């Protein structure tokens, strides 16, 4: 049972609703950060930042951000200090986001997948463990340090 | 002809050399930020931060970050202030990254695509114009302001 913060704009809104239901039915705890209704002109960054901020503030939780293409949503989420947001476009990439990047969040482009495909991605994301492998941790650490100082690490 | 800053770790290294060749042959200006050799144990963040930093520092340029899965690489690039790095997993997502997100960078997962698929992704990214549509600019602006102030925009 994972806690999962969900954020979506209008383009991800109906998929977000289906994912909430799916997560409830599969033993997890979805928390809706908005949008709480369909507003055709609404702007994804607020909801992505909301979901990412909550996820980083609640260590051990996960987050999913949803819009049309997934890319703006993950870009926005990655601007939150400490957040690592992968773009999940397949079951394999959702799994690797957890296993290699210890990604707390994924973005999913609601316009790029059928509901069934999207729910399979969600499943992979919420069930795949972080490997804790030394090299993966080292790379996350290097990034975390860069976030702290904004000093670009040297290239060999 | 675009200027394109390229970064890669060992997993994206061979694909990078291939993309450099392709960009030269198609009238563009690639600039290699490393890795300059195959090193099986090397760490993607420095190469991605390097490419993203150079790209943001040179308005009008684009950048491409390359690794195994693409996701760690775009996460790293997105930590650079002002950088918008999309995960390009298809010709469509490469195109929309430019059209909708005015993304200066894409990440590509070398282990996820054939060379021919990757090069078609590259072509879409370096030839698709930014739309400049009001709503897309507004969202990019909202994100830039969050980046500047870390004041999370309010959610309805
Ligand atoms: O405003 P519309 O619905 O056309 O587009 C909204 C979408 O724009 C871009 O594609 C963003 O990456 C994001 O996915 C957002 O959901
Ligand atoms: O160290 P190895 O080669 O197993 O993996 C390296 C890869 O790790 C992760 O997948 C990152 O997202 C990135 O794609 C990197 O290139």
What can you tell me about this protein's structure?
Two copies of one chain form a homodimer. Chain A has 156 residues and is an alpha/beta fold. Chain A has a single domain (1-156), classed as 3-Layer(aba) Sandwich (Ribose 5-phosphate Isomerase B, Chain: A). The first copy, chain A, contains six helices and five strands, in the order βαβαβαβαβαα. In chain A, strands 2-1-3-5-4 form a five-stranded parallel β-sheet, sandwiched between helices. In chain A, helix 4 runs parallel beside helix 5 (115-127). The radius of gyration of chain A is 15 Å and the shape is globular. The termini of chain A are far apart. The interface between A and B is large, with 52 and 54 residues. Bound molecules: 6-O-phosphono-alpha-D-allopyranose (2 copies). Chains A, B: Homodimer. Chains A, B: It catalyses: aldehydo-D-ribose 5-phosphate = D-ribulose 5-phosphate. Chains A, B: Belongs to the LacAB/RpiB family.
Named at the architecture level, the CATH assignment of chain A is 3-Layer(aba) Sandwich
Main beta sheet strand tally, sense and closure of chain A: 5 strands, parallel
Portion of residues in beta strands of chain A equals: 15-25%
Query: Considering the protein shown, what is the CATH homologous superfamily of chain A?
Result: Sugar-phosphate isomerase, RpiB/LacA/LacB
Biggest interface, CB < 8 A: A-B, 52 and 54 residues
PDB class: isomerase
Keywords: rpib, RV2465C, isomerase, carbohydrate metabolism, pentose phosphate pathway
Assembly: dimeric
Entry title: Crystal structure of Mycobacterium tuberculosis ribose-5-phosphate isomerase B in complex with alpha d-allose 6-phosphate
